[PDB]
Symmetry: D3
Subunit: 170 residues, 6 copies
Amino acid sequence: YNTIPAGKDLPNDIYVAIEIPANASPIKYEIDMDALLVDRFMATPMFYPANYGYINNTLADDGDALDVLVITPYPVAPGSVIRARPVGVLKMSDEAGGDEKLLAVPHEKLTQLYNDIHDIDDVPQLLKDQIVHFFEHYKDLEGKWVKVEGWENADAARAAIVKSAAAYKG
Amino acid sequence: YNTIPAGKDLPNDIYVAIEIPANASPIKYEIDMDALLVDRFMATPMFYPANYGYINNTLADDGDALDVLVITPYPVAPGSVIRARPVGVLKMSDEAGGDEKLLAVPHEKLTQLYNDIHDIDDVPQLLKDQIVHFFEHYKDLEGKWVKVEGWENADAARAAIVKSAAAYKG
Amino acid sequence: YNTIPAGKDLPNDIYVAIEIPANASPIKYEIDMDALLVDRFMATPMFYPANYGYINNTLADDGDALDVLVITPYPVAPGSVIRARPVGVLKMSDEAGGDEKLLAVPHEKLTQLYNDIHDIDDVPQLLKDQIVHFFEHYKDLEGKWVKVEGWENADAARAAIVKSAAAYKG
Amino acid sequence: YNTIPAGKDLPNDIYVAIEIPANASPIKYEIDMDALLVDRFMATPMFYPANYGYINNTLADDGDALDVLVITPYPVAPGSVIRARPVGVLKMSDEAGGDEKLLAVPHEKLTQLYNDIHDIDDVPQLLKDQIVHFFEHYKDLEGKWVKVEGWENADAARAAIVKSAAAYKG
Amino acid sequence: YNTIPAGKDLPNDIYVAIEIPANASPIKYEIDMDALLVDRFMATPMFYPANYGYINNTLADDGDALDVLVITPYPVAPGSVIRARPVGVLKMSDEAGGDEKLLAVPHEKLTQLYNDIHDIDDVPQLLKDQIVHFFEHYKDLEGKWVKVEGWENADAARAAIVKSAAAYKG
Amino acid sequence: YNTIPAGKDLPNDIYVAIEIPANASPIKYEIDMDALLVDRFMATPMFYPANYGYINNTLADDGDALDVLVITPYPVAPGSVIRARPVGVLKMSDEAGGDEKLLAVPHEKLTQLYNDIHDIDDVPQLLKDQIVHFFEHYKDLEGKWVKVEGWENADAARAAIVKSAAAYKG
Ligand code: NA
Ligand code: NA
Ligand code: NA
Ligand code: NA
Ligand code: NA
Ligand code: NA
Ligand code: NA
Ligand code: NA
Ligand code: NA
Ligand code: NA
Ligand code: NA
Ligand code: NA
């Protein structure tokens, strides 16, 4: 997992290592040890609206790799890697400070399904609202809290990827 | 579905017709027509912490049959019937007025797993907290709202079953 | 199953009794006997791109009830009923003569997901192409064959529902 | 469920109403009330090697309808009906006396997969051994016990169907 | 898999690499090659009552790493790692000599669900009885046999972890 | 994944690294990076009739490792390895030239289920016909095409493994 590239051509052509599939049981996996760890069994009765993972060889303003949600037509396996392109970013804050969750779709080479989704406005509204709801509430029953600020666009997402890839010094 | 009895011996020995399994996809089934209808695809990214259905031949102070959640070791099929016994009731309110969701376990004849669960205090705390969280939030993305008041005990649940069975005049 | 209405307000507000879920194992259920029968285990290694069923109290120009595919965000259970609205119809022929498979989305009351899908052009192209492919090929390994003609619009679908409801004399 | 025929042409062409799918979670459904009931959550950590149900309008020497296991390439839904043909019968005894579990395959009209399975010798040995093991052990953790005697052939199965259909007086 | 630590703080704070999820299909995975191998398709129609794996960098009195079952609210993926704490150990014998299967729960950091389970008496009786039944019978249809002796407590489990970690010389 | 052996004893005793399980969702995984990548979401509404992967340290006349389908009683996880033995090979062509898909069963040590399957004639006809159908059609909705030639026997499969293992120079 340490050796997966951030992307073929940052910031628009990235690899996301998926930790948690969309619509899965409430097991919060995290890739550590070179291993898929169980970080927690999520306490709230919720599921991730899209697959959740990160871009390797990035360092977010919060100390871990940059987080990314990837929309797919079928949930992918934990630990699998998906070639993707960013379409937006959700800004938030928690008990540990600021955070952002990018939103991405699979690269055109993987599927024609998202050929008309190029920026955050193109993503179905209900899915965005569900991602917001999830991040507002998923920690409600964990000493952990979350405040969600709002969406920014694909340029802002690409900016996050550039910043975080530059910050990585490993 | 019209012809399923409320129970072998109300209020402590009931039948619950299950509409929605625990931990299922967000399809909100309702038994109508003598049919399992799709009432809605739930908008919020949540799941029912326990199986959800109702007692036939009851009329809740809200116009439909009395609602009951049934804890089981494995989610049951929509449309199946489970012989159960009440252990508590969760009181709430919504856009249509007052409401209550009973909590029950399968009858002893079905499983020895719940032999030590006789009242609401005996139910695992996290499961209660998850049921509360679910009812507080499940309608967040639907013109529909919900305020949750709190738990009452097995006697209060049995009282709800008596009241609702008396109210049924069909 | 005999007693489910064709719809609240034909032709635009219908009920579809689902026989086969989208993306399911290759069991071709049919509602008979008032029962969910197994008609066949499908020989070809394919799945239905959308839920498949029929409108009760209709008689298609082919002798059985009018067939309808219903797009949903999650596959529904066999034997469940979904309130739906037509968006198009796929015309074809087989070893028994002409046939048509309507395409529908859930009624607005069930979900906001399809508020912008009002006619066949609004349906994602790949999904249409997959439905075509499925009907072209699903009988390839069964003495049964199928020739697919092409899509017609929501008005043509509504016309099929009117014709078939009129033809029903039961 | 009361109104499903025993078969198109007994004893070789039967209908089996399935209660429990092959390879399913340990929920022991039974068709009652015209309803799919949960009879028990099975205590032993086992699964049915083949779908399990019964032939309607039969009365086994044990007081309930004749029991039948149906081999299929994919587990079927509880409550569905499968047109089948008998290939053997497993004789046993329990806390309530003698019992027999027929073994059947889907009718040729449903699948070509079993065209070479006409009697008990033709059934894969491991599957037979697993069905034996299951019936020997499934009640180990329930005041209920079971002794398994052995297989008899398709003629003996057909004989069981004739006897049980004659015994039904409802 | 070779490089996963035995634990943060043996013997009470361990890592278990899971090979087989609870309630899964009968595929007996084993971690080898640095790979998840299929060791066998289990012949008996049974499932593991809890997730099954081992502690890395241990050597059991039987030649392979120390075996551990981990109770979780949802089955975890094969190949994932769970931080756990021992609560008991099941002693047995087979065709190759003595053996022991530890029982553990996830560490408090992963879930509050097991805060009241500190020793073997606190584990639900039926689950213990099912684990016993499984180990008594899972090899019934494999030239392989098993005799189960009985449970010992959390101190005995911790003793097994100490012994086995000391024995590892790799 | 780079370090998994081709086999214990080529050509009859091989290891297949599985990329795509039988009967799975249409995610076309490929093992790359030492990683399970998503190569594509398959456009056609089809599934693999048997698990699909490759033999490591082989080079097919087409530039990648030799492809193998492995029949199992339960689909295995992507990324798992199965010890297998060849029973036949399906010859074909595509947009990139000639290709072959071996067919194999698990080694006897893993299961007794295939003890009577030693060559291609012994494999169930419908399964062969489904594998043919799948390879004829799976690329129908992808600028990619496929022409299927026909089956050859277990000796021809073993010949393919010898040729491809010799060709590997890594
Ligand atoms: Na972050
Ligand atoms: Na919190
Ligand atoms: Na209510
Ligand atoms: Na609302
Ligand atoms: Na038709
Ligand atoms: Na045909
Ligand atoms: Na019987
Ligand atoms: Na017993
Ligand atoms: Na051991
Ligand atoms: Na044995
Ligand atoms: Na190839
Ligand atoms: Na093509």
